[PDB]
Each structure stands twice: as structure tokens, then as C-alpha cells.
Amino acid sequence: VNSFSGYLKLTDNVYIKNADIVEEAKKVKPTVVVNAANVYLKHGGGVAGALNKATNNAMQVESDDYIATNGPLKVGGSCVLSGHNLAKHCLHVVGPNVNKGEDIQLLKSAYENFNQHEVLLAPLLSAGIFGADPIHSLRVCVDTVRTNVYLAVFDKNLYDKLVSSFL
Numbered sequence: 147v148n149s150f151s152g153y154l155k156l157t158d159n160v161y162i163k164n165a166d167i168v169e170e171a172k173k174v175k176p177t178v179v180v181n182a183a184n185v186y187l188k189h190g191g192g193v194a195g196a197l198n199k200a201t202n203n204a205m206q207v208e209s210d211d212y213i214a215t216n217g218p219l220k221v222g223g224s225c226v227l228s229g230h231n232l233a234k235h236c237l238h239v240v241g242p243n244v245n246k247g248e249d250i251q252l253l254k255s256a257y258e259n260f261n262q263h264e265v266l267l268a269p270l271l272s273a274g275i276f277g278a279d280p281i282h283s284l285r286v287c288v289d290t291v292r293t294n295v296y297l298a299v300f301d302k303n304l305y306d307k308l309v310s311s312f313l
């Protein structure tokens with residue numbers, strides 16, 4: 147039993163809700179919140195910009211030190227950093243950005259990072275400003291993640307289309 151509330155159950159291990167991931171994180175304080183990161187951990191917009199703003203830029207400060215030490219992530223890769231005031235940990239995961247020409251097949255590799263954590267609060271990878279089809283992203287999530295994932299979909303209209311079209 148966990149403290150996630152109001153989710154629809156899609157499969158044994160995947161759940162979905164219309165919610166602002168920032169407000170969800172502040173309420174649940176989950177063990178792991180997933181950020182929709184880029185390889186430079188430049189949290190300028192989308193989910194990343196919103197999460198970073200909620201940390202008063204502490205996420206960006208930590209991220210800049212991470213990059214200065216380790217260099218950029220790989221597309222499809224991840225790193226674990228602090229969750230600041232939002233969660234215990236933040237799993238920064240880089241899904242392919244279609245608006246940069248990146249290979250959509252890497253979306254499965256991106257979701258594989260979730261399997262290293264028993265429970266996560268997460269957005270749909272490569273959705274939003276990353277340019278991929280969110281219906282496809284949900285399908286890859288369900289077919290790749292085996293741990294317990296709670297998906298926050300900010301757009302209510304998008305949420306209803308994902309539920310109604312889910313196979």
C-alpha cells in the first residue's frame with residue numbers, strides 16, 4: 147500500500163492520473179520522481195522547467211555540478227540526483243526529443259531506467275515539448291516498465307484520450 151490517490155489502474159503495475167506532477171510530488175513526497183531531462187540537464191521548460199522552478203533552482207545548481215564532473219548523459223540514459231523538496235530522489239531520464247531528430251526507438255531504453263526503482267511518480271517520456279506521440283509513449287511504458295509507475299498527465303484533454311484509446 148502506498149499514498150498515491152485517485153489513479154486509474156491500466157495494468158498490474160501501471161497507473162495513470164490527470165495531475166500536475168509538481169503538485170503531485172509536493173503532496174505525496176514519493177521516493178522517486180522522474181524528470182523528463184535532456185542530456186545537459188538544462189531544466190528550461192516542460193516538466194523539467196516546472197520541477198526545477200518548484201525547487202527554487204536548487205535542481206539546476208545540483209545538475210550543473212553533476213555535468214561539470216561527469217559530462218552529458220546519453221539519450222536513453224539517466225542519473226539519480228536529489229529530489230530536493232519534491233521527493234527523496236529525482237531520476238533524470240532522457241527520452242529522445244523528436245524535435246531534435248533523435249531516434250524514437252531509444253524511448254524503450256529510456257523507460258528501462260524505471261525498472262531500477264520499485265515505485266516511481268513519472269511523466270510520459272518524450273511527450274510534450276519532446277515531440278513524440280503520447281499514446282505511443284504510454285504503450286512503450288506499459289510494455290517496458292515492470293516496477294510500479296504512477297503517471298501524471300498534466301493535460302486533461304490528453305488524459306481522456308489516453309484512457310479511452312488504451313488497449
Ligand SMILES: C[C@@H]1CCC[C@@](O)(CNc2ncnc3[nH]ccc23)C1
Pocket residue numbers: 165166167168192193196269270273274275280298299300301304
Ligand atoms: C502537454 C504535455 C503533453 C505530454 C504529456 C505531459 O503530461 C508532459 N508534461 C507535464 N506532465 C506532467 N506534469 C507537468 N507539469 C508541468 C509540465 C508537465 C503534458
Ligand SMILES: [Cl-]
Pocket residue numbers: 192193273274275276
Ligand atoms: Cl512538456
